[PDB]
C-alpha cells in the first residue's frame, strides 16, 4: 500500500514495486473542481472526473522499467473558466521478489498448517557432514562442505530494475533481533550475511535482471521460548539524498517454520538395531544379531571400552527424525541420564546425515524417568475426530507430585510438547522401581483394525493361565525350570501366596489406570489391546519389579519379536508362558523368539527392549500437513 | 472411565464417583455361556444375555451412599446344565466435585475463549491491600486482610460420602510442579495448602456432606514462558491397605486462565490525571488542573522532592487494568527507564485496589523507546472481519535493525504480545530524536463513523496552511509571536527555506509509512484520519524534533483537549495554527485548550502528553469473550 501525493507546483518522482497497490492523492495539493488523467502505455489507471477526495485513483504497472521515470502520469486540473494546470508524476517500476518454497514441493507473510496451508520449512542443521569434526555443522558461521547445503533451505531474491537503479536505492536483508540467534543465512555466488549477531546486511545488487540465492539453516528446535517461526525480510531503501537518512520504500518477507523433532513408533519398519552387549554376556547378542538380519537391519554395537559397563542402550537415547520437502534425516535425542553410554550418541550416532539434540541438566538433577525407556510413541490414531497421524508421545509420570515422586525433567517435557505434532500424553509409571512406560506397554503391528495391538503386562492373565494349568493337574510344575541358580517355585505355591496376589492386585490397579488413560487419549477399544501374562513383586519402597522376565519389554522388528525368555512352568514339553504369548501374537502374523536375558539383564531390572534401540523409517505423512 | 473386574471366586469391592462412567468386565474371570444381572435399587444397569466380551455393561448410580457397599450387583453365570454361580460386587457411591466459576458470572478440563467458552478466570494479586506495606500481596504466603480475598478466585470442593469413608480413602489437592511457582491456594474455614514449593496437600475431610472453600491467587502474568493456564486437581486415593501404596481412584480438575494486563485508549473516559509539574513551572499545572476538573477527574501530582526534576510523567508508567467476573482493578506497568520518577509507581500508584507490574532490566540496557510515550493503544477496531474489541497496542520501532537503530526492549515486547488481547502492532518511530509514537499520533473521540479520529502530525498540512496565508497577503506574519526569547521567523522565509522543506519532506515520508501501516493493521480509511498541521526539523544524527510545539502530543480528556500552544503566526487577531486545529476538531465536538508549555516542556523535547498521564475506565467488553 502506497499513497503518492501529486502537485501542480512540482513534478513528483516515485518507485512502484510490481505486485503492490499504488494510489494517487489528487485532491490535497490541487489548485483552484474537475480533473482528468493521462498515463503512458505501461500504466493502468483504474478509477471527466470530479475533484472530491473520496474517489480512488489506483495505478498499476505491467512490467519493470528500462530507465528511471520511463512511465509518466499527467493529472490535468480544469474547471469553470480555467485553462488546464497539469501535474506530473514520473514512475519507475521494479520487480523485487523474495522467494522460498512456500508450497512445500521442493519448489502471504503468515505460516499456516495443513494440506492447503503456506509457508516454507527450515531444518535445524544439527548433523555433522564435516569430514573429521565433533561439532554440529550449525555451531560455526561457515558452509564447510557442499553437501551441507542439502540440509539448508533455498531462498532467492529476484530483481528486475533499470541498469542504474541501485545508484540511488539499496536493498537490505534482515531478521528481527529476537530471532537472529536461531537462524543463519548464507549468500551464494558461500558467506554469512545474517546470523546470531548480524541481524542485517546490505546486499550488493547490480541493476537490470539479477537473481541472488541464499541458503538458510536453523539453529534451535521449537521450545518453550520459541514457537518455531523465523521471519526474514528484504527492505528497499531510497538513498537518493545525501543529506537525509535512508527511507524505506517497500518490505517483503518469508516466514519459515522450523521442523520439529519426531519419534517413530514400533509399527514403523526398523532400519538399524543398537545393542551394547559387549560386556560379560555373548548369547544375548547372538539372538538380537539374528533378528536384525531377519528384519533386514544394519546392526551397530557398542563395545565395553566405550560402554563403561553400561548395557542399557534403550535409555541414553531416542532416534527420531526431522523432515522438510527438500531433506529428511534421522536425529538422536540424547537423554541427560549420562551414564556409561554418555558419549555414544555424540561420537557414534551423530554424523553424516544424522542429527543431534539434547536437553535437561548435564551434571545432576536427573531421575530414572529421564532415561528413554520412559520415552515412547503410539502408532497413528484418530481420537473422537482429532487425527494424530504421527501418533502421540507417551511418557511416564506419577499421578500427583509429592516428596517421594518422580518425573521426567520439565525441560525434556517442554521440548517434547513444543514439537507439537505428537501431542504428548503423560502416563503413570512411577509405581515401578525403574519407572519406565516400556515396563508395562509395547506396541506391535497387525494386519487388521487400525494396524497394531497395544500390549499391556497383565497379572490377571498369568493367574488365569496358572489356575487353568492347576485345574488340569499341573500344580507341581515349576516356574524357573532350566535355571541353575534360583529358588524354584511351584505353580501351586505361587497361587496360594496371598502377599504375591496382593502385590499383583496393586500392580494390576496401576496398569488398569494406564489402560483407561490410553483408551481415552488414543481412542482405543478393548479389541486394540492384548494382555501379556506377567507377574510382578513389590520390593524397596513398595515399588514394582518383574517376578520373571518382563515379556512386554520386547524388541519389535516388524513381524520379528525379541521377547525375554520367561523361564516358565514346563507343561507338555513347553513353557506355558511362551505358549500363551505365542497363542496371542502368532495369529497376528508375529514370530516370537524368546531370548535368554536372565543373568545379564533381568537380574539388573530390565530386559530385551531395555538393552536395545531401533532406528525406524520416518512416516511418509508430512508433519506440516497436520493441524495440531 | 473405570473397568471393574468381577469374579465368582471373590466378591469385589469398588467406589463409584457420581458423574463417572463405570463398566463391568464380566467375561475375563467367569467360570465354565450365559449371564444375568441383578442390582439393588440405586444402580442403573444399562446394557437373558450371552457371555461374549464385546457386550458393554455399564453401571450408573443415582445418589451418594449412606454406608460402604450399600449398593450391590449380582452377576449370575448359567448355561447348558449348570446351576447358577453368582459373583458379587459391592459398590459405594460418592460425590466429589471440584467447582469454580467456569461460566464467568461470579458463580470440561480445557479452557476455551469466547461467549460460548468455559473456564474460570484468575487474577494476578499484584496490588497492595495490606495496610502499611511495600510488597504486592502475592509476595508472601498469607492472607493478611479480609479484603484481599476479593481479588482471589473461589474454588469449592463438595463431598457427599458415608460417615466412615475417609478412614480408608484420602483426598489430595495438587498443581503440577511446572506451574506451582505461578499460583498460591489457601484453605478457608486462611492458610496455604498450595504454592511455590508445596505442589500437593492432603486435605482433612470428614465423611457425610462437606463443603470446603479455597481461595486462589496468581503470581505471574502470562509471558513468553507462561501461556497463562493453571490447572488444579483433586485426586481421590484408596488407602485401604496398610501394606501397599496409595492407589488413585478418581481425578478431577479446574483450569484457570490468568487475566492479561490491558491498556486503555484515549477514547475510554478519563478518571484520574497525573502530572509531576512541581518543578520550575506553575502555569502548566493550572491549565491541566482546569481540564481535569472540567473532565471530572481526580488529580494527582508528584512534587519535586519525589520527581528528582523528572517532569515526564507519561514515560515511566502506563496505567492499564486486569479484569475477572468477580473483580476488576487498575494496574500500573512500570517502565524500566528508571529516571527521577522511578519510585512514583511503586510508592504512590501501587496500593489498595491498584496493581503493579514491571519488566525489562532495572539497571541499564535501556533505550528511549522503553519509555511509555512510545506505548499506546488504538480504539476498538475490526480489520477485514477480525474484531479487536479492546483495540491494539501500538509501539514504536525502527524499520529494520542496524548498529544505530533502537527498539523497545524485547522483554517488554514479549510481555505485551503474551497478553494476547490487544495484539501489538509495531510502528516506525525511530526517525524521531526521542522516538515515541505519541510524537506523531493521537486518537480522539468522535460521535460518528467508528467513534474516533486518528490524528497524525502533518508537515503537508502546515505548508498548505502557510502558503494559503501568504497567498492572502500575510507573508510577513511571524511564527513565534508572543515569545520573549527566540529567533522570530516570517512565513515567507519559512516557505522559501529549501532545507526545512527537504527535512519535512523526509518526515512526511516517515509519517506516511505509519499512516499506511495503521490503515492496514487497524482497518482505517482516509475518513478516519485528521491531519494536524505540524513542522519538524532534523538535528543530531538526522533525527526529527518538533519545529514548534508538537500539537499532536496532546492530553485527551474526553471532549476536553490539552494541546500545546504553537506560538503560530497571528492573523486576524489569532494564531492560524490554533485556528486550523480548531476548525478540524471543533466540528467533532472537541474543546481545544492551548497550553503554554514552551520553556518548560517543548525546549526539552516533549509537550503536554509527554508531561502527563491518564488512568481511564476499563472496557465494558470482557476480554475472555474475545477469540484472539
Ligand atoms: N526398562 C528400561 N528401558 N531400562 C531399565 C534399566 C534398568 C537399570 N538397572 C540398573 O542400572 C541396575 C540394576 C542392579 C544393579 C546396578 C544397576 C536402570 N535402573 O537404569
Ligand atoms: N514524547 C514523550 N512521551 N516524552 C518525551 C520526553 C523527552 C525527554 N527529554 C529530555 O529528557 C531532555 C531534553 C533536553 C535536556 C535534558 C533532558 C526524554 N528524552 O525523555
Ligand atoms: Ca557451518
Ligand atoms: Ca549439515
Ligand atoms: Ca546423554
Ligand atoms: Ca546432511
Ligand atoms: Ca524409548
Ligand atoms: Ca498475601
Ligand atoms: Ca490483593
Ligand atoms: Ca520504572
Ligand atoms: Ca484489592
Ligand atoms: Ca503511553
From Swiss-Prot, chains A, B:
<feature type="binding site">
    <location>
        <position position="316"/>
    </location>
    <ligand>
        <name>Ca(2+) 5</name>
    </ligand>
</feature>
<dbReference type="InterPro" id="IPR036556">
    <property type="entry name" value="PAD_central_sf"/>
</dbReference>
<dbReference type="GO" id="GO:0140798">
    <property type="term" value="F:histone H3R26 arginine deiminase activity"/>
</dbReference>
<keyword id="KW-0539">Nucleus</keyword>
<dbReference type="Pfam" id="PF08526">
    <property type="entry name" value="PAD_N"/>
</dbReference>
<dbReference type="InterPro" id="IPR004303">
    <property type="entry name" value="PAD"/>
</dbReference>
<feature type="binding site">
    <location>
        <position position="137"/>
    </location>
    <ligand>
        <name>Ca(2+) 1</name>
    </ligand>
</feature>
<dbReference type="GO" id="GO:0042802">
    <property type="term" value="F:identical protein binding"/>
</dbReference>
<feature type="binding site">
    <location>
        <position position="151"/>
    </location>
    <ligand>
        <name>Ca(2+) 2</name>
    </ligand>
</feature>
<feature type="binding site">
    <location>
        <position position="604"/>
    </location>
    <ligand>
        <name>substrate</name>
    </ligand>
</feature>
<feature type="binding site">
    <location>
        <position position="129"/>
    </location>
    <ligand>
        <name>Ca(2+) 2</name>
    </ligand>
</feature>
<feature type="binding site">
    <location>
        <position position="125"/>
    </location>
    <ligand>
        <name>Ca(2+) 1</name>
    </ligand>
</feature>
<feature type="active site">
    <location>
        <position position="436"/>
    </location>
</feature>
<feature type="active site">
    <location>
        <position position="610"/>
    </location>
</feature>
<keyword id="KW-0391">Immunity</keyword>
<dbReference type="GO" id="GO:0140795">
    <property type="term" value="F:histone H3R2 arginine deiminase activity"/>
</dbReference>
<dbReference type="GO" id="GO:0004668">
    <property type="term" value="F:protein-arginine deiminase activity"/>
</dbReference>
<keyword id="KW-0378">Hydrolase</keyword>
<keyword id="KW-0156">Chromatin regulator</keyword>
<dbReference type="InterPro" id="IPR008972">
    <property type="entry name" value="Cupredoxin"/>
</dbReference>
<dbReference type="GO" id="GO:0006334">
    <property type="term" value="P:nucleosome assembly"/>
</dbReference>
<feature type="binding site">
    <location>
        <position position="140"/>
    </location>
    <ligand>
        <name>Ca(2+) 3</name>
    </ligand>
</feature>
<feature type="modified residue" description="Citrulline">
    <location>
        <position position="337"/>
    </location>
</feature>
<dbReference type="Pfam" id="PF03068">
    <property type="entry name" value="PAD"/>
</dbReference>
<dbReference type="GO" id="GO:0006325">
    <property type="term" value="P:chromatin organization"/>
</dbReference>
<dbReference type="GO" id="GO:0036211">
    <property type="term" value="P:protein modification process"/>
</dbReference>
<feature type="modified residue" description="Citrulline">
    <location>
        <position position="184"/>
    </location>
</feature>
<feature type="binding site">
    <location>
        <position position="127"/>
    </location>
    <ligand>
        <name>Ca(2+) 2</name>
    </ligand>
</feature>
<feature type="binding site">
    <location>
        <position position="353"/>
    </location>
    <ligand>
        <name>Ca(2+) 2</name>
    </ligand>
</feature>
<dbReference type="GO" id="GO:0032991">
    <property type="term" value="C:protein-containing complex"/>
</dbReference>
<feature type="binding site">
    <location>
        <position position="335"/>
    </location>
    <ligand>
        <name>Ca(2+) 5</name>
    </ligand>
</feature>
<feature type="binding site">
    <location>
        <position position="142"/>
    </location>
    <ligand>
        <name>Ca(2+) 3</name>
    </ligand>
</feature>
<dbReference type="InterPro" id="IPR013732">
    <property type="entry name" value="PAD_N"/>
</dbReference>
<dbReference type="GO" id="GO:0045087">
    <property type="term" value="P:innate immune response"/>
</dbReference>
<keyword id="KW-0963">Cytoplasm</keyword>
<feature type="binding site">
    <location>
        <position position="338"/>
    </location>
    <ligand>
        <name>Ca(2+) 5</name>
    </ligand>
</feature>
<feature type="binding site">
    <location>
        <position position="375"/>
    </location>
    <ligand>
        <name>Ca(2+) 4</name>
    </ligand>
</feature>
<feature type="binding site">
    <location>
        <position position="151"/>
    </location>
    <ligand>
        <name>Ca(2+) 1</name>
    </ligand>
</feature>
<feature type="binding site">
    <location>
        <position position="129"/>
    </location>
    <ligand>
        <name>Ca(2+) 1</name>
    </ligand>
</feature>
<feature type="binding site">
    <location>
        <position position="148"/>
    </location>
    <ligand>
        <name>Ca(2+) 1</name>
    </ligand>
</feature>
<keyword id="KW-0804">Transcription</keyword>
<dbReference type="GO" id="GO:0140794">
    <property type="term" value="F:histone arginine deiminase activity"/>
</dbReference>
